[PDB]
UniProtKB/Swiss-Prot annotation, chain B:
Molecular function GO labels: DNA binding; RNA endonuclease activity
Name of the protein in question: Endoribonuclease MazF9
A biological process term (GO) from this entry: negative regulation of growth
Swiss-Prot/TrEMBL induction comment: Mildy induced (5 to 9-fold) by oxidative and nitrosative stress, starvation, growth in the presence of isoniazid or gentamycin, strongly induced (24-fold) when grown in a non-replicating state.
Organism name: Mycobacterium tuberculosis (strain ATCC 25618 / H37Rv)
Keyword tags: Endonuclease, Hydrolase, Nuclease, Toxin-antitoxin system
Family membership: Belongs to the PemK/MazF family.
Coiled-coil positions: none
A Pfam entry, by short name: PemK_toxin
Keyword Iron: no
């Protein structure tokens, strides 16, 4: 049981170059039928958007996540340009859930970054 | 190695290792799906991250989140299928060489597969 919108701590190592690395929170963004399939076999993959506490300059393909509603300890930003499909074994520990507003803007960021305007 | 001129829809050979579980692994073709503003930025800076869809020649069953890619037009040596469920942002340091490009109809199917997989509507 993992669901779209949930924030999990995930293990991204090893990484190369500007790829998000270390262990960090990430938002599940794959659909829940795929999530259910991945949990079924046990293996399978799920797609997540990594999160960083280094807010700095926020781009239109990135979304500010509130520590107050997510369970995070500080406000972070989800980087849609770092989207990654991961083996379920990289899931470490659940932290929380994004609001509906935050998730909707993350759908917008994904559509922008991947040029999915239709 | 290569000059970083990758653009959306192109097929490039990329190094995905090391990988865990069902993650697409080793060096294999993948389809560039990140927007060309970001890709051109990566060209200008000579570094960045490029979002790709890895490819497998194990056709088997083509699910709605996967797209059949023909050997005739891609420059691939056999028919392959793009796996939207394996979408991954990768360092430009992982790009090995350009292979070719998918057709516009194939890229449109890949757009639909991505929207399906990531639960997006437009």
């Amino acid at each position: 049981v993992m669901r779209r919108g949930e924030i999990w701590q995930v293990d991204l190592d090893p990484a190369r170059g500007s790829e998000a690395n270390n262990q960090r929170p990430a938002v599940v963004v794959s659909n829940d039928r795929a999530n259910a399939t991945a949990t079924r076999l046990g293996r399978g993959v799920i797609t997540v958007v990594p999160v960083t506490s280094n807010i700095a300059k926020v781009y239109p393909f990135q979304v500010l996540l509130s520590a107050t509603t997510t369970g995070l300890q500080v406000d972070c930003k989800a980087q849609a340009e770092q989207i990654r499909s991961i083996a379920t074994e990289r899931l470490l520990r659940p932290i929380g859930r994004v609001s509906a507003a935050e998730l909707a803007q993350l759908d917008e960021a994904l559509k922008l970054h991947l040029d999915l305007w239709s």
